[PDB]
Each structure stands twice: as C-alpha cells, then as structure tokens.
Amino acid sequence: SGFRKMAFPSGKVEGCMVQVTCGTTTLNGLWLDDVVYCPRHVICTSEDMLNPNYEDLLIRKSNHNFLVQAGNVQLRVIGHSMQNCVLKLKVDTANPKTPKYKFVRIQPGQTFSVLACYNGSPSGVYQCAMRPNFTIKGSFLNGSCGSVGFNIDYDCVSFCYMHHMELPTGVHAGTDLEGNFYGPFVDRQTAQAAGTDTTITVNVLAWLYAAVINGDRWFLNRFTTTLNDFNLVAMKYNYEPLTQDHVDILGPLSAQTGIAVLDMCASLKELLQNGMNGRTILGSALLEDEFTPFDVVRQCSGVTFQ
Amino acid sequence: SGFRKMAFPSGKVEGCMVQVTCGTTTLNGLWLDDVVYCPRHVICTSEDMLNPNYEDLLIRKSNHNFLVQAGNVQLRVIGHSMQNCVLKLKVDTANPKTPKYKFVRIQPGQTFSVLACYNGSPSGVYQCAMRPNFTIKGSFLNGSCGSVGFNIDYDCVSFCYMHHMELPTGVHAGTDLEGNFYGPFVDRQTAQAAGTDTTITVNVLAWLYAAVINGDRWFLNRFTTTLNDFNLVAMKYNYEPLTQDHVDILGPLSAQTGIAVLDMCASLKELLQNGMNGRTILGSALLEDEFTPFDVVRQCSGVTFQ
Ligand SMILES: CC(=O)Nc1ccc(C#N)cc1C(F)(F)F
Ligand SMILES: [Cl-]
Ligand SMILES: [Cl-]
Numbered sequence: 001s002g003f004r005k006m007a008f009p010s011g012k013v014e015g016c017m018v019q020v021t022c023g024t025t026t027l028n029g030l031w032l033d034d035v036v037y038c039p040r041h042v043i044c045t046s047e048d049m050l051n052p053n054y055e056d057l058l059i060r061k062s063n064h065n066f067l068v069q070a071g072n073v074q075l076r077v078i079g080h081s082m083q084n085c086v087l088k089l090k091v092d093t094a095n096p097k098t099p100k101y102k103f104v105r106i107q108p109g110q111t112f113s114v115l116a117c118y119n120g121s122p123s124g125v126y127q128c129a130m131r132p133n134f135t136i137k138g139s140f141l142n143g144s145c146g147s148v149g150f151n152i153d154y155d156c157v158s159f160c161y162m163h164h165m166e167l168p169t170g171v172h173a174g175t176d177l178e179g180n181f182y183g184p185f186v187d188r189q190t191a192q193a194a195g196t197d198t199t200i201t202v203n204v205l206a207w208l209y210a211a212v213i214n215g216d217r218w219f220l221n222r223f224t225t226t227l228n229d230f231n232l233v234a235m236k237y238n239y240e241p242l243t244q245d246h247v248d249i250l251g252p253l254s255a256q257t258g259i260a261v262l263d264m265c266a267s268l269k270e271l272l273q274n275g276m277n278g279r280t281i282l283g284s285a286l287l288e289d290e291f292t293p294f295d296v297v298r299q300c301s302g303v304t305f306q
Numbered sequence: 307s308g309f310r311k312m313a314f315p316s317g318k319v320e321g322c323m324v325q326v327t328c329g330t331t332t333l334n335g336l337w338l339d340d341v342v343y344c345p346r347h348v349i350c351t352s353e354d355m356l357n358p359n360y361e362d363l364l365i366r367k368s369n370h371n372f373l374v375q376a377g378n379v380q381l382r383v384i385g386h387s388m389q390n391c392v393l394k395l396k397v398d399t400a401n402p403k404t405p406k407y408k409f410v411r412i413q414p415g416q417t418f419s420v421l422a423c424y425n426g427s428p429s430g431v432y433q434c435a436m437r438p439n440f441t442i443k444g445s446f447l448n449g450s451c452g453s454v455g456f457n458i459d460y461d462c463v464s465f466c467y468m469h470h471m472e473l474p475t476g477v478h479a480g481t482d483l484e485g486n487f488y489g490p491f492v493d494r495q496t497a498q499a500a501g502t503d504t505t506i507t508v509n510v511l512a513w514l515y516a517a518v519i520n521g522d523r524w525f526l527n528r529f530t531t532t533l534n535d536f537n538l539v540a541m542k543y544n545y546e547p548l549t550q551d552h553v554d555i556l557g558p559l560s561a562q563t564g565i566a567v568l569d570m571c572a573s574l575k576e577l578l579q580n581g582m583n584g585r586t587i588l589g590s591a592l593l594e595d596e597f598t599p600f601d602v603v604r605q606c607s608g609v610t611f612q
C-alpha cells in the first residue's frame with residue numbers, strides 16, 4: 001500500500017554527469033558516447049547574456065577553452081558545435097558508462113525525473129511535470145544549469161530536459177536534449193515570464209484512481225457526466241480540456257476500480273464546485289496533477305528497471 | 307528557487323541491490339563487501355507466520371538453500387548468520403560496486419530516501435520520514451521487503467532502514483541494518499498496530515523557515531510565545547512536543563531569516579488556529595512535516611529572498 005511521488009532510479013544518469021567550465025562559469029554537462037551536452041549559455045559573460053550572438057561568441061573559443069571534468073579526471077575536448085540552444089563538446093573518450101538512451105521531447109502534462117547536479121556532482125532527484133505553460137516547478141540553485149530530466153522505459157533512458165534558467169516567479173525553463181526550448185523562452189537575460197498555468201485534468205483523474213486503489217473513497221458518488229458537460233466545468237476552473245484520448249488512456253484504471261472516467265469526472269466536478277470539506281485525498285488537501293495515468297499504473301504494479 | 311521533496315541520487319544503492327530466494331519466497335537483499343543483508347523472515351513458511359522460532363528455522367538451512375542473484379549472476383553463499391531480525395549471508399564475491407558506507411540508526415523525525423525494489427531490481431526512489439510512532443508512510447508492494455532507506459553525506463551512504471512489513475493501516479515497519487526494529491514491532495503476523503501518529507513539529511517549523519527563505523511571509527504575525535505555552539497549544543493539535551534541542555537546532559535558520567524560533571512558533575500557533583484561508587505555503591495547503599532542519603539548509607539558498 002501507499003502512494004508517493006516517485007522518481008526513477010537515477011544511477012544510469014548519474015554515471016553520465018560531468019562538470020563543464022568555460023571562463024568563470026561552471027555548470028553541468030551530460031556525457032554520452034563521445035559528446036558532452038550542456039547549455040550554450042555557458043560561453044556568455046553577464047554582458048554577453050544581455051544580447052548574445054552565440055555563433056560569434058563561439059568562434060573565439062578553442063577546444064582547450066572548455067574544461068570538462070568527469071569525477072576527478074579531465075576530459076579532452078576535441079571539437080565543439082551548437083545544436084539550437086545546446087553546446088555539443090566532442091571528447092576523445094567515449095563514456096564507458098553510457099546507458100542505452102534516446103533523446104525524446106515530451107508533451108505538457110507528461111512527468112519526468114530531474115537529477116539536480118552542481119559541479120558535475122549529482123545532489124538530488126525529484127519528479128516533475130511539464131506544465132501546460134511549459135515551465136517546470138523545479139528546485140534549482142545557482143550552478144544547476146545542465147542538470148537533466150529523464151524517464152526510463154525498459155533499460156533505455158529517455159532524456160527529455162536540460163535545465164537552462166529560472167523565471168522571476170521561481171519556476172524553471174529548459175530545452176530538450178536537441179536544444180529546443182519548452183515554451184516561448186529564449187536563452188538571454190531579458191524580460192521573460194511564465195504564462196498563466198492550468199491544471200492537468202487527466203493527471204488529477206489518474207491520482208483520484210490512485211486514491212481509490214489505496215482505499216480513499218469518500219469523494220465517489222452515484223453520478224456520471226458527459227465530456228461536453230465536464231469540459232465546461234474544466235474550462236471554468238482553469239483545468240485543461242479532457243479529450244477522448246485521455247478517457248481511453250484511463251480505460252485500464254476505470255475497469256480495475258469500477259469507476260468509469262465520466263463517473264470519476266463527476267467526482268471531480270463536485271470537488272471543484274464544493275471543495276474537500278475538511279477532508280484529504282492521499283494525504284493532500286489540494287488536487288494533485290503531477291502523476292500521469294502511467295505513473296499510477298506503474299507504482300500500483302511494481303515495474304522495475306534493472 | 308523552488309522547494310521539492312527531494313531524494314538522494316540512488317545509484318550508489320542501486321549497485322548493491324540483489325535478489326534473495328529461500329524456498330518459495332523471493333525478496334531483496336543489500337550486498338556490501340562480501341555480505342548480503344536481508345530480512346530474516348525470508349526463511350518463514352506459511353505455518354511460521356505467527357510464532358516463528360527463527361533460531362530453529364535457521365539451523366535447518368544450509369548455505370545452498372539461499373539463492374542470491376545479482377543481475378544475471380548467481381552469487382555463492384559461503385556462510386550465514388542472524389543478527390537480531392536481519393540475515394547476513396556471506397558470499398564468495400565482494401561487491402565491486404560497494405560504496406563508502408555506514409549503518410546508522412535514526413530517530414523519529416529524521417528523513418531518508420527509499421529505493422523501492424522488487425526481485426532485486428530498483429523501481430523508484432522517494433523521500434520518507436521516521437514517524438513519531440516509528441512507522442514510515444511508504445509505497446511498498448508485495449515483494450518489496452529488503453528495500454532500504456538511506457542518506458548520502460558527501461560520498462558516504464548511511465543505511466538507516468530495511469523494509470520488513472506493512473501494518474493494517476497501510477503504513478510500514480522495518481529495522482536498522484543491525485536488524486533492530488524501529489518501534490515496538492516484531493517480525494510475526496500477530497496483531498500489532500501503530501500508535502496514534504503525531505506531527506513532527508520541529509520539521510514543520512523548518513519548512514516554514516524554508517517558505518520565508520524562498521520569499522513568503524504571509525503567515526507571520528506580530529506575536530511570540532513561551533516554549534511551554536507553545537507546547538500546551540500544539541499538543542492539542544496532535545503535534546509532537548518541541549524541546550530545547552529542537553529550538554537550538556533551528557538556530558541557523560532563525561539567524562538566516564531574522565525570525566526568532568519562538569516567533570516562528572507563534573506563527574505556527576496561528577496557522578493551527580486559522581488554517582490557511584485558501585492560501586498555500588510552498589505549494590501545499592497542509593503544513594508539511596517531512597523536511598528536517600538539515601534538509602531545508604541543504605536544499606535552500608544561503609541568501610534569503612528580501
Ligand atoms: C544574470 C543572468 O545573466 N541571468 C540569466 C538569464 C537568462 C539565462 C538563460 N537562458 C541565463 C542566465 C544566467 F546568467 F543565469 F545563466
Ligand atoms: Cl537521527
Ligand atoms: Cl496539500
């Protein structure tokens with residue numbers, strides 16, 4: 001029994017983290033095969049950061065301008081180039097600890113594990129969701145840039161996030177591992193803000209199913225609803241629209257618990273309109289939206305990553 | 307910025323998890339140097355649940371009755387002994403992945419990371435606290451016994467928990483790595499029940515200091531309290547007594563934020579009286595008690611916001 005916000009085991013990614021120094025800046029890199037990936041803003045001064053021309057800044061750098069430490073051994077950079085907002089540093093040695101991996105770009109609402117790192121040293125691991133407004137509600141201090149986010153699907157690590165910056169409201173923005181930002185952000189010191197966020201409806205439903213599976217049933221009721229009717233309610237409460245694909249994805253949980261998705265939607269409608277009346281669900285007084293349907297199924301079945 | 311339930315990177319522990327099989331029972335073991343640690347109830351049969359005599363069960367076993375598998379490799383068991391409620395299986399290979407480590411018994415309120423495992427392979431990592439009633443609120447399915455909890459200081463893994471059983475309320479009980487249970491529990495299926503649980507007051511105060519550090523002051527007030535008056539109030543809400551030890555422990559966070567410990571106690575008193583009135587603290591609508599003072603200092607900046 002029990003339900004906890006759970007990260008993937010981080011060992012396979014820990015073996016890939018390195019320290020990258022350029023000038024006075026140190027941050028983290030991801031060492032896979034013979035390339036180290038890190039944010040291209042590592043090459044900027046604070047003045048550069050105000051309006052950078054990254055190609056122009058890069059051409060003045062030599063391979064030897066990039067100090068890369070894997071643990072306590074230096075890595076020899078032998079080439080350098082950019083792909084979108086990530087710098088690719090070719091090194092003379094393949095990482096012997098490279099896991100089976102892919103670069104994937106995730107959708108808003110999808111979750112992933114973040115391995116927060118400082119000076120190439122992993123320091124903590126936690127679970128995030130890509131918010132509808134394309135930020136993540138992370139926990140990052142100075143020096144964490146280049147920390148990565150990932151899922152594990154078999155023995156394959158799917159890298160999906162590189163940390164780049166913190167927005168004024170304290171949430172975070174980054175890229176996929178091909179250097180494409182999530183969200184309407186740029187790697188420049190200029191006025192930027194998170195857009196208004198919304199709640200991930202299909203994930204809240206997943207968590208309600210998790211709650212039922214764990215014996216928390218007080219919010220269940222006799223009523224059901226329709227998609228159109230429910231989506232009117234969702235829109236009024238700044239919840240994302242629930243689509244038919246969402247319903248299909250929740251199918252397994254509906255069959256296992258005996259609560260059809262629109263049956264559960266009626267529970268959620270009543271919770272939105274009336275609150276929780278002093279009660280909690282899985283120990284929370286808020287409706288939790290950073291568990292995907294897959295997260296709930298995985299944690300409520302015991303899937304492992306040897 | 308940000309504040310998350312953050313676990314330690316699990317890779318150092320991942321490299322120690324093995325599968326231990328005895329008869330029809332399979333569970334997890336912890337392989338350090340040439341010893342595999344696991345719950346002694348692995349030797350119990352279906353008749354042995356209520357009043358096992360472990361000395362009598364164990365003396366009937368030979369080294370080759372224990373099957374230990376590390377990844378795809380069988381390890382050879384060359385010795386076995388019982389220490390309290392853990393079995394120590396001596397094997398013919400030192401684990402080449404053994405980290406720097408120690409065994410430490412923790413006190414209620416202390417936090418640690420759990421690497422949930424099944425069949426010797428890690429599933430997920432999350433953060434737990436030893437409750438005042440010596441249980442933990444984990445996420446554990448059948449086959450998770452022998453999963454461990456740990457902290458990592460620098461590069462040294464401190465193992466502090468081994469998972470043994472789930473109590474009827476769905477909370478979890480286990481031992482330190484010397485096999486001594488936390489709390490009054492025993493490895494028998496005789497009826498036993500967790501004591502009423504209480505809130506870890508010093509941790510709530512730590513977390514309120516975290517909120518101030520990340521820039522939230524809305525819950526402070528102009529008042530203070532004596533330590534004894536605080537405790538008289540807080541225990542009416544099922545909060546643990548706050549000791550002078552706890553007040554001393556909070557000194558650093560008090561100095562960093564400029565809010566005296568007993569002034570923060572006054573804020574807590576008001577929060578218990580008033581609730582949050584539709585507001586949140588660090589993203590929660592409930593007061594959080596599974597962050598220790600040490601956790602807050604490790605995760606938060608050293609510079610308080612405003
Ligand atoms: C002071 C400053 O330049 N802040 C800043 C702003 C945006 C981005 C991006 N992307 C990165 C930074 C940096 F410097 F913290 F790396
Ligand atoms: Cl302790
Ligand atoms: Cl909450």
Ligand code: NA
Binds near residue numbers: 222223224263266
């Ligand atoms: Na219903």
Ligand code: NA
Binds near residue numbers: 306320322377426
């Ligand atoms: Na293993």
